[PDB]
Amino acid sequence: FNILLATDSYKVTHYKQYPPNTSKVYSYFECREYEETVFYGLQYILNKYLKGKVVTKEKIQEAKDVYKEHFQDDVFNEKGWNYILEKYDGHLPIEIKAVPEGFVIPRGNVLFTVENTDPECYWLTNWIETILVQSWYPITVATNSREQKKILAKYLLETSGNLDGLEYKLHDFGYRGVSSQETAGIGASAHLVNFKGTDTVAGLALIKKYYGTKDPVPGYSVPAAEHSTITAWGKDHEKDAFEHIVTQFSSVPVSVVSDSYDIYNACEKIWGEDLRHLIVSRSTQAPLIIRPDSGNPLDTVLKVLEILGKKFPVTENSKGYKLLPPYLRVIQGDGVDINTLQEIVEGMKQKMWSIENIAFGSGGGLLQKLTRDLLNCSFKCSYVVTNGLGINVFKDPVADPNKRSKKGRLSLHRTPAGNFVTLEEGKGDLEEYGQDLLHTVFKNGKVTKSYSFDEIRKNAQLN
Amino acid sequence: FNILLATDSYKVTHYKQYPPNTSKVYSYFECREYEETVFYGLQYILNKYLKGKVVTKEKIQEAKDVYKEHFQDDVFNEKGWNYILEKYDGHLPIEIKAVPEGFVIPRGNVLFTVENTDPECYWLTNWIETILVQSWYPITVATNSREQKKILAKYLLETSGNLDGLEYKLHDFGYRGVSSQETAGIGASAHLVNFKGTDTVAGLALIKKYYGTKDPVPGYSVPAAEHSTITAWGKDHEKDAFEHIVTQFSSVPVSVVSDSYDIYNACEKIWGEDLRHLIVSRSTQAPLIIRPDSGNPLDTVLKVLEILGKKFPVTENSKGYKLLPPYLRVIQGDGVDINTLQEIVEGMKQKMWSIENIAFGSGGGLLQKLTRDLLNCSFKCSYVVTNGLGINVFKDPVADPNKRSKKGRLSLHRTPAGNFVTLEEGKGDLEEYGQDLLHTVFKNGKVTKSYSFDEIRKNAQLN
Ligand SMILES: NCCCCN1N=C(c2ccc(NC(=O)N3Cc4ccncc4C3)cc2)C[C@H](c2cccc3ncccc23)C1=O
Ligand SMILES: NCCCCN1N=C(c2ccc(NC(=O)N3Cc4ccncc4C3)cc2)C[C@H](c2cccc3ncccc23)C1=O
Ligand SMILES: [Cl-]
Ligand SMILES: [Cl-]
Ligand SMILES: [Cl-]
Ligand SMILES: [Cl-]
């Protein structure tokens, strides 16, 4: 990796575009205008990409050579990057202040600021927009995962009367569904801010290296089947595959995808009759979790439950809602996003089914079907000093008030009703709102404040 | 990186689920039945992740330790992975056959096949599903980029009478709007299969290291402004920013975002009157590219052009379509995906505007607003040998016919009419068709067949 090569092409040219005698560019990150967002992911970027000696003689010459051919001119700022190398031993003269990781912030507030600490490096603040704005993703996953926790919590509380197993109810299936190994880790780490159930292994090593937990790993799995391990027995032997699988994993929970041929037959005839004896004997600590994986998600869950309710002893819990015996659960792991997770719980509740009957697997919903669009994640200049005069800088497009940017030096404050407000135009220094809630997280190549994954989990908890 | 940590958790448990006496698992990848999809990206994964010594004593012990905590049990196949280390010096005993990269194959056809080469490693075929299936992303970017090239080609040919500059008409803007650095490089490399214009610099080093080009670089940029470099001059000095920027970049093409306050004023009064004189003097090899970045994309482009047509000398070209003078072009960079790119060119054509007037930049649309669900990218077991007898295996969910999988040993063939067929049940060995178009790309830890980025470009041409 080379930070000189980790920006949008055009930013290479920007040091020739700013007003002359510009000593300071100051830029903020907000989720412009999902009423509240989990701030998480910055600390990864600060450590993996921004901290320490990031500039070397070789990194300057590589960039020089690529940009020379990429632009077909020598528009690269060699002098500016050689200054970083020789003044600061390659350490970025940037100061980043940020709200603490895990913080649940209303939309349209300052979550971090970037500014240069050396007037020579005025151009450096917005060089690192592109890299810093990839934060959108950890923030977005963490927010959409938490929104889903909220829906599950609402219907579990309504149909059971507690949150038991809440943080194991949305399993991450998204390892194949993402754009990369780097993306898998960050995405799966963002979901583990809210839940403890993941198949995306890469997330675990990231949290250990970048955040830390007191526990060995932040996330857990149980044994489960895929279509390869059922269908490999042959279209005539589904029962043999199931029987081998529940018996191999007799003492632990086990997911078995049951839609290889006929979900409704596998539930009713194979689990419900021929193998019923291997399921009703199993421990409360080791249920069979029947996985449908195809068809209308809501219709399939409701017919799966009706079949299972008629072949197994169903309890009515305190709330008047029906419950499988504790050895038997369901997980819908196909076509699940925040919208369909909500269609299912509401559909289950209208049929008087407890939500403790159902778990969710999401892959693409949770980790891939997200954009910087969704929460309008955005990095803009708000303040510059030219000729010694600080001036308040913003965009305010004619046709889009939604894209207006915030003016001048920003601080984040607690209101007397204990809500958040971003103060603009350096009005934070009028101490009308107490102290700035953002902290210095990065200064002059060093990480100056960091959070355990446990602290972030605590910060991110639901009301 | 540790391939023992680079799979779905549940696949760790799969070696205890397959029928006993299973010597071979054979699995294929399809874009299950965007009519045609560019295969690109496998070679990256084979080199970065699968080739050489991938197993070490330390990588087995690390996996054992993580999975012990992750499963709350020792379900890990240490014996199976120690065999790989001690038999094959950690080289995967896998054979992957793949269609040549850049090959444009209709939906529902085998693109790559994975099989174990040693009976002991039956479990290893689907260990690498997760990692291999991330290919959906390079494939989907490459295909969606190409389908957009098709629409550009259609409307340019209809309104100009050639495809001049087609490879620079869709610029990659999506570096900040992807989920990570690794994803940027892959996605930007996938787009450059079809175009030459990128701001996603990370794509350059990937193509150089993994694919190779005869030219210095596969992709090119020009100097261009952001909101920070216009608004930094002060709300009332937009004209000074513009004038500084186009004068700095007098002799090369220059993109200038003009929606900082009011796009329509900046086109009509600032470009069209105040600074008119520095635009009409510019070389045909260095035009001003006015970038609107806000509003209804179609409505904005149409009023932008109507304003510019009334301040600058417009020609009607041979097709009856209108043309800005050669020093003046427009780029819509904001809200651009395949569907809005199509709304715009069709809207432009209804207002008799040549498509050679307009360039497109795409960020989120191009690199992130893509899912594994779009082309149904899918990896399934089709054939296993159990007790020495091959059996043809598949899924066939009753309630989703389109998730039915192919049976048995697969090959890809040219038809008599120059189309493709995927043969099933090992029918390829009848040579009633020509010969299998999949080739050995990976065998027993080696990349065996590779393609230059140039070969891939050639294969991925339009008609
Ligand atoms: N971890 C200890 C706590 C309990 C364990 N546990 N585990 C659960 C789980 C854990 C992993 C898996 N995994 C798969 O199915 N895969 C892996 C995978 C990867 C890629 N593609 C497809 C698949 C299929 C499935 C289920 C669901 C399940 C539970 C099922 C009902 C309702 C519940 N409600 C609350 C709390 C859990 C509840 C559950 O109890
Ligand atoms: N090497 C020579 C290639 C041609 C030069 N050129 N370049 C062009 C271009 C090149 C880069 C940029 N860059 C930005 O605007 N950024 C960078 C960026 C990154 C992230 N977010 C936002 C932005 C804003 C914009 C436009 C458009 C422009 C052209 C404009 C009309 C129609 C055409 N038709 C065909 C061929 C080009 C045609 C064009 O001619
Ligand atoms: Cl599966
Ligand atoms: Cl999914
Ligand atoms: Cl911009
Ligand atoms: Cl975009």
UniProtKB/Swiss-Prot annotation, chains A, B:
Lineage top rank: taxon: Eukaryota
Biological role: Catalyzes the condensation of nicotinamide with 5-phosphoribosyl-1-pyrophosphate to yield nicotinamide mononucleotide, an intermediate in the biosynthesis of NAD. It is the rate limiting component in the mammalian NAD biosynthesis pathway. The secreted form behaves both as a cytokine with immunomodulating properties and an adipokine with anti-diabetic properties, it has no enzymatic activity, partly because of lack of activation by ATP, which has a low level in extracellular space and plasma. Plays a role in the modulation of circadian clock function.
EC number: 2.4.2.12
Descriptive protein name: Nicotinamide phosphoribosyltransferase
Activity regulation, short description: Inhibited by FK866. FK866 competes for the same binding site as nicotinamide, but due to its very low dissociation rate, it is essentially an irreversible inhibitor.
Gene Ontology annotations for the cellular component aspect, listed alphabetically: cell junction; cytosol; extracellular exosome; nuclear speck
Pfam families per UniProt: NAMPT_N, NAPRTase
Binding site for diphosphate: 176, 227, 291
PTM annotation (Phosphotyrosine): residues: 168
SUPFAM superfamilies: Nicotinate/Quinolinate PRTase C-terminal domain-like
Tissue specificity comment: Expressed in large amounts in bone marrow, liver tissue, and muscle. Also present in heart, placenta, lung, and kidney tissues.
Binding site for beta-nicotinamide D-ribonucleotide: 199, 291-293, 333-334, 364, 372
Protein family membership: Belongs to the NAPRTase family.
Gene Ontology terms: biological process: cell-cell signaling; circadian regulation of gene expression; inflammatory response; NAD biosynthetic process; positive regulation of canonical NF-kappaB signal transduction; positive regulation of cell population proliferation; positive regulation of ERK1 and ERK2 cascade; positive regulation of gene expression
Quaternary structure, from the entry: Homodimer.
Modified residues (Phosphoserine): 452
Pathway: Cofactor biosynthesis; NAD(+) biosynthesis; nicotinamide D-ribonucleotide from 5-phospho-alpha-D-ribose 1-diphosphate and nicotinamide: step 1/1
Catalytic activity: beta-nicotinamide D-ribonucleotide + diphosphate = 5-phospho-alpha-D-ribose 1-diphosphate + nicotinamide + H(+)
Keyword tags: Acetylation, Biological rhythms, Cytokine, Cytoplasm, Glycosyltransferase, Nucleus, Phosphoprotein, Pyridine nucleotide biosynthesis, Secreted, Transferase
Enzyme class: transferase
Molecular-function GO terms, alphabetical: cytokine activity; identical protein binding; nicotinamide phosphoribosyltransferase activity
Signal peptide region: none
Localization in the cell: Nucleus; Cytoplasm; Secreted
Lineage start: Eukaryota, Metazoa, Chordata, Craniata, Vertebrata
